[PDB]
Design a protein around this ligand. Structure first.
Ligand SMILES: [Mn+2]
Ligand SMILES: [Mn+2]
Ligand SMILES: [Mn+2]
Ligand SMILES: [Mn+2]
Lengths: 194, 192
């Protein structure tokens, strides 16, 4: 149902509800089992509704800017550590629009941090206003495929994702150059053997 | 997957052993000041992309099923755990499979104080296994939302390792959190 739309065009519409979500990420030299390289830490979360999503939430664009709304949502959900860390217009990536079930536009941001910054974010998430309520926990996204050819990313893609968050994740994998187009197809295939 | 006994368990030959625990605490918190959380139940995202309970393998002949579990927990949840009891009284059940080379997993349910769960979550990011075997802790939503889908039923549509779903369901019956009919209602809501 979701369709692409430019930021600028989408900011012009009327009586549309807006949401902002961010992928925070950082490179890692860690190797799982000292063999399988982690490569990069991507944060997602388990939401109060039983589903996985990226942090963020609604913004009222007549009151505050998209970035200001995003900063506030992250503070609630991810905690104090998000202060001084500034997701800006540069971090903006894409906008999608729908009408079923509600007139609704979601914006997706992608921001690289230093590893210790992600770690400090994890360490302090348990202190967020939303911890154990709207946010049920923070999780890192496995980017590897294991030898059984299912465990890791393919298996993880069989989890339950809110809205278009799965599709956003896949976008980021292709944009941060982490997987080739075919690799993504391979991942969706290995996943879909239910 | 077939239910078995502790009695037998330790005596079978050629099987690999695994221990897992549900740590849980009561809670007075209300989501949107409306929906009661009731209880906090810990699970995790594994390195394999699946949800499960903390723990792992333990050499049967080396030390007791508790000694293996308590080590596994400390390794996966962090230092805080060295002061968790995890006695025999916390033992719960043992299922036996013949899939990925004959497994036997034992399930443990143990009640803690909310503070204790909170301090565990707070130190989990320090566990030897953080960012490796354990990719993050999560609380299990026990409520069902107004849409009659979000909350627990949606949660059960996630990808679960081994029989950690069976185990979770058992806990909800065992801990008197849900009746059999109510469990049967979330499953139908979920698998729809
Ligand atoms: Mn959110
Ligand atoms: Mn929010
Ligand atoms: Mn909030
Ligand atoms: Mn271990």
């Amino acid at each position: 149902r979701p369709r692409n739309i430019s930021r600028e065009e989408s900011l012009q519409l009327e009586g549309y509800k807006h949401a902002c979500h961010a992928l925070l990420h950082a490179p890692s030299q860690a190797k799982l089992f000292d063999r399988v390289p982690i490569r990069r830490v991507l944060l997602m979360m388990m939401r109060f509704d039983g589903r996985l999503g990226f942090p963020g939430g609604f913004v009222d664009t007549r009151d505050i800017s998209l970035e200001e709304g995003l900063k506030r949502e992250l503070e609630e959900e991810l905690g104090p550590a998000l202060a001084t860390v500034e997701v800006t217009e540069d971090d903006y990536r894409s906008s999608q629009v729908r009408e079923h079930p509600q007139k609704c536009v979601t914006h997706f941001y992608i921001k690289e941090l230093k590893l210790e910054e992600i770690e400090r974010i994890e360490a302090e998430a348990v202190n967020a206003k939303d911890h154990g309520l709207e946010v049920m926990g923070l999780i890192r996204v496995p980017l590897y495929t294991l030898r059984d050819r299912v465990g890791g990313l393919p298996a993880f893609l069989c989890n339950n994702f809110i809205g278009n968050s799965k599709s956003q994740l896949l976008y980021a994998l292709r944009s941060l150059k982490l997987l080739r187009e075919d690799q993504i197809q391979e991942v969706l295939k290995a996943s879909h053997r239910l």
